[PDB]
């Protein structure tokens, strides 16, 4: 006859298939806690040590599975702690439900303890942002929040006065709309548009296909188009792994979390096929300033001709359109453009291999990542924090379609490594999970290493300890007139942090220590989380956006300095390969 409104809210979550949710309790959210407590069998509550980790792990759930992530915070400071996770979900356009505690309706607007108007707090981050005021409609408001988060690929926020979830409502009135949920059946792209686009791509002398994560289902088509047509591939950093890194004509990504061949080739390309791509550096870096024809495939009308004046923009699914292109083309013989790029890639990979293959001496990030590679399972998931690690992981990890990797792509909040890995292990208990974090980002969320312990989540945490905000030190070196400030700091020993949260850990500072430590960690992570604190050097990684290798573009002094600093003596500029196969710039 009656049901507690709170019990009904949990039944809405269960109807939408929410497996786990994150938060920290408080008096202002104890009636939702009370309903969760009764439903421990069907929905798994994960108590975090800081609510931002809950919000970031919710976003990561959605990044990994496509299913809505769920978090909560108590009134006032519980909810405002969510913000870095919620902005991450907004900017990374993944569905997240955030519940916010509120004082009961009898005390709202009385200026009582921790009581404020919480609605304006969430207005900017949230696609849907409402304070519930009635128990009977509360299940519907939760259902509405979820349906909107999914439909609009963003954050829904609901402030809940704590009295409402303890009120009885009729048992037969509330429902969830999870049963109506479906994915659309999209039309095929028009043959005429696809044909026009194909002719332009094929007529190019120096073509590139430049994809982002909108092409995540088109890995097969991308690689086969490349091989058949002899057109090199480049991607956004997040799109790494869609085509295996092994692929000899994968150039990497452009800009700064970037690889030399992609930046060089992009500068030379006459035609770019830009697919499922919203590259944020397009305009500011003038990436397409020498491009003759810009062709686009995107599913979102908001993106059409967004990043560059577009000759042909096809509104369509990436995979369907790329498959449709593939169906109308056939073999082209190897071209000088193709051979020049292959040779350029080869030269670049040998450079990266020479960094990895050092056997003895002062530990660098490069050998640490090689050691990750050596213990990694073919379907490992990598949760990656924010800083030099993005650049290093982008160059060194050897990813294929079986892997996943996530970071905070656009909002780029430090601290995501720990919660991303928590979410990954909760969704995929049988898959190996890494957290690769710099010392700055790891220190921001370090308390939640305890959450991995408490819930027995066998994450392999690898902390890169340079005692710097390395990413920012290098920026200051490029722009700042005065001395470094705020970017070099005191050591934290993360093996001791790990010990404090009752997690097994190692600290290493020499290349020769890696094989045995990483072997131990692999084994430990069969049952329990582990941490490796890698004390690395302060060497600046090669800046792919500031290459000094080409005699025609840089002074001989500039080149010798760059080669020295970046151990880059055997790197050749793309122009060398262009000339080799009989082409100019």
Ligand X SMILES: Cc1cc2nc3c(=O)[nH]c(=O)nc-3n(C[C@H](O)[C@H](O)[C@H](O)COP(=O)(O)OP(=O)(O)OC[C@H]3O[C@@H](n4cnc5c(N)ncnc54)[C@H](O)[C@@H]3O)c2cc1C
Ligand Y SMILES: CC(=O)c1sc(CCOP(=O)(O)OP(=O)(O)O)c(C)[n+]1Cc1cnc(C)nc1N
Residues 375-414 contacting its own copies, CB under 8 A? 408, 410-414
Binding window for its own copies (CB under 8 A); candidates: 36-44, 261-269, 333-341, 517-525: 36-44
Q: How far apart are CA 3 and CA 357, in angstroms?
A: 64
Contact stretch for ligand Y (CB under 6 A) within 35-43, 317-325, 336-344, 410-418: 410-418
Q: Which of 38, 77, 113, 350 binds ligand X (CB under 6 A)?
A: 113
The binder of Mg ion chosen from 241, 438, 529, 573 (CB under 5 A): 438
Parallel, antiparallel, or unpaired: how do β-strands 530-535 and 460-465 relate?
parallel
466 labeled binding residue: yes
183 Cβ neighbours under 8 A, 6+ residues apart: none
Interface pattern 447-476 for ligand Y (x via CB under 6 A): -----------------x-x-xxxxx----
Q: Which stretch binds Mg ion (CB under 5 A): 15-23, 114-122, 199-207, 438-446?
A: 438-446
Q: Which is nearer to ligand Y, 298 or 439 (CB)?
A: 439
Interface residue with its own copies, options 1, 192, 330, 479 (CB under 8 A) = 479
The answer to whether the annotation marks 585 as part of a ligand binding site is no
Q: Which residues pair with 70 in a beta bridge?
A: 97
Give the rounded distance of the alpha carbon of 236 from its chain centre: 11
Burial 500-525 (b: 16+ CB within 10 A, else e): ebebbbbbbeebebbeebbeebbebb
300 binds ligand X (CB under 6 A): yes
Residue from 423, 413, 411 nearest 448 by CA: 423
Please choose, out of 58-66, 76-84, 252-260, 543-551, the segment that lies near ligand Y by the rule CB under 6 A: 76-84
Binders in 64-83 for its own copies, by CB under 8 A? 76-77, 80-81, 83
User: Does 312 contact ligand X by CB under 6 A?
Assistant: no
Residues 6+ apart with CB under 8 A from 392: 365, 366, 369, 464, 541
- Partner whose footprint covers residue 241, from ligand Y, Mg ion, ligand X, none (CB < 5 to 8 Å by kind): none
Say what angle helices 417-427 and 51-65 make with each other, to 10 degrees.
50
Residue in 109, 166, 161 with CA at minimum distance from that of residue 131:
161
8-state DSSP, 103: -
- Total number of residues that touch ligand Y (CB under 6 A): 26
Q: How far is the CB of 248 from ligand X (least distance, A)?
A: 20
Footprint of its own copies on 221-280 (CB under 8 A): 278, 280
Residue 405 CB, shortest distance to ligand X, in Å, is: 11
Specify the DSSP class assigned to residue 301. G
Q: What angle do CA 167, 8, 151 make, to 5 degrees?
A: 125
Q: Is 409 annotated as a binding residue?
A: no
CB 582 to ligand X: min, Å? 31
Determine whether 192 is exposed, middle or buried from the number of CB atoms within 10 Å of its CB (0-12, 13-18, 19+): exposed
> Which partner in ligand X, ligand Y, its own copies, none is near 582 (CB below 5 to 8 A by kind)?
none
Site for Mg ion, residues 460 to 489, rule: CB under 5 A: 466, 468, 470
CB 467 within 8 A of CB 435: no
List the one residue out of 472, 478, 468, 483 whose CA is nearest residue 538: 468
Q: Any contact of residue 238 with ligand X (CB under 6 A)? A: yes
Binding to ligand Y in span 520-559, by CB under 6 A: none
Query: How far, in Å, are 87, 164, 190, 400 from residue 302 at the CA level?
Result: 20, 39, 20, 30
CA distance 129 to 91: 17
Residue 500 interacts, among its own copies, Mg ion, ligand Y, none and using kind-specific CB cut-offs from 5 to 8 Å, with its own copies
Q: Which residues are at the interface with ligand Y (CB under 6 A)?
A: 24, 26, 74, 77-78, 81, 114, 385-389, 412-414, 438-441, 464, 466, 468-472
Residues that bind Mg ion (CB under 5 A): 438-440, 466, 468, 470
State the residues that interact with ligand X by CB under 6 A. 113, 212-214, 236-239, 253-258, 276-280, 297-300, 303, 317-318, 386, 390, 407-410, 412
């Amino acid at each position: 006859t009656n049901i507690l409104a709170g019990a009904a809210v949990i039944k809405v979550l269960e109807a939408w298939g929410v497996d786990h949710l994150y938060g920290i309790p408080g008096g202002s959210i104890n009636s939702i806690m009370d309903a969760l407590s009764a439903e421990r069998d069907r929905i798994h509550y994960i108590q975090v040590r800081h609510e931002e980790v809950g919000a970031m792990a919710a976003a990561a759930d959605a990044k990994l599975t496509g299913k809505i992530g769920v978090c909560f915070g108590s009134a006032g400071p519980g909810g405002t702690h969510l913000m870095n996770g919620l902005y991450d979900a907004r900017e990374d356009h993944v569905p997240v439900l955030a519940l916010i505690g509120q004082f009961g309706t009898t005390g709202m607007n009385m200026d009582t303890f921790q009581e404020m108007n919480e609605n304006p707090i969430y207005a900017d981050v949230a696609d849907y942002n409402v304070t519930a005021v009635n128990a009977a409609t509360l299940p519907h408001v939760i259902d509405e929040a979820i349906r909107r988060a999914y439909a609009h690929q963003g954050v829904a926020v609901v402030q809940i006065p704590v009295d409402l979830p303890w009120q009885q409502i009729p048992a037969e009135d509330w429902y969830a709309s999870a049963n109506s949920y479906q994915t659309p059946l999209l039309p095929e792209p028009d043959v005429q548009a696809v044909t026009r686009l194909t002719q332009t791509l094929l007529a190019a002398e120096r073509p590139l296909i430049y994809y982002g994560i909108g092409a995540r289902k088109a890995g097969k088509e991308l690689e086969q188009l490349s091989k058949t047509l002899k057109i090199p591939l480049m991607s956004t950093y997040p799109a790494k792994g869609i085509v295996a890194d092994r692929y000899p004509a994968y150039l990497g990504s452009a800009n700064r979390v970037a690889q030399k061949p992609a930046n060089e080739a992009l500068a030379q390309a006459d035609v770019v096929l830009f697919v499922g791509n919203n590259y944020p550096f397009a305009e500011v870096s003038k990436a397409f300033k020498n491009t003759r024809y810009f062709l686009q495939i995107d599913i979102d009308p908001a993106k059409l001709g967004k990043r560059h004046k577009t000759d042909i923009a096809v509104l369509a699914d990436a995979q369907k359109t790329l498959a449709a292109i593939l169906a109308q083309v056939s073999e082209r013989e190897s071209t000088p453009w193709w051979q020049a790029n292959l040779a350029n890639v080869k030269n670049w990979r040998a450079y990266l291999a020479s960094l990895e293959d050092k056997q003895e001496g002062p530990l660098q990030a490069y050998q640490v990542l090689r050691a990750v590679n050596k213990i990694a399972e073919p379907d490992a998931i990598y949760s990656i924090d924010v800083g030099d690690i993005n650049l290093n992981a982008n160059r060194h990890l050897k990813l294929t379609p079986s892997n996943r990797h996530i970071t905070s792509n656009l909002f780029a909040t430090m601290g995501v490594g720990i919660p991303g890995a928590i979410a990954a292990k909760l969704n995929y208990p049988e898959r190996q999970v890494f957290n690769l974090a710099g010392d700055g980002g790891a220190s921001m969320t370090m308390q939640d290493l305890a959450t991995q312990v408490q819930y027995h989540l066998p994450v392999i945490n690898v902390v890169f300890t340079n005692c710097q905000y390395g990413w920012i030190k290098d920026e200051q070196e490029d722009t700042n007139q005065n001395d470094f400030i705020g970017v070099e700091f005191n050591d934290i020993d993360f093996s001791k942090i790990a010990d404090g949260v009752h997690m097994q850990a190692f600290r290493v500072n020499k290349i020769e220590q890696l094989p045995d430590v990483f072997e131990q960690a692999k084994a430990i992570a069969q049952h329990e989380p582990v941490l490796i604190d890698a004390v690395i050097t302060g060497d600046r990684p090669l800046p792919a956006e500031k290459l000094r290798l080409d005699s025609a573009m840089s002074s001989a002094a500039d080149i010798e300095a760059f080669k020295q600093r970046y151990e880059a003596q055997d790197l050749q500029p793309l122009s060398t390969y262009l000339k080799q196969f009989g082409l100019d710039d």
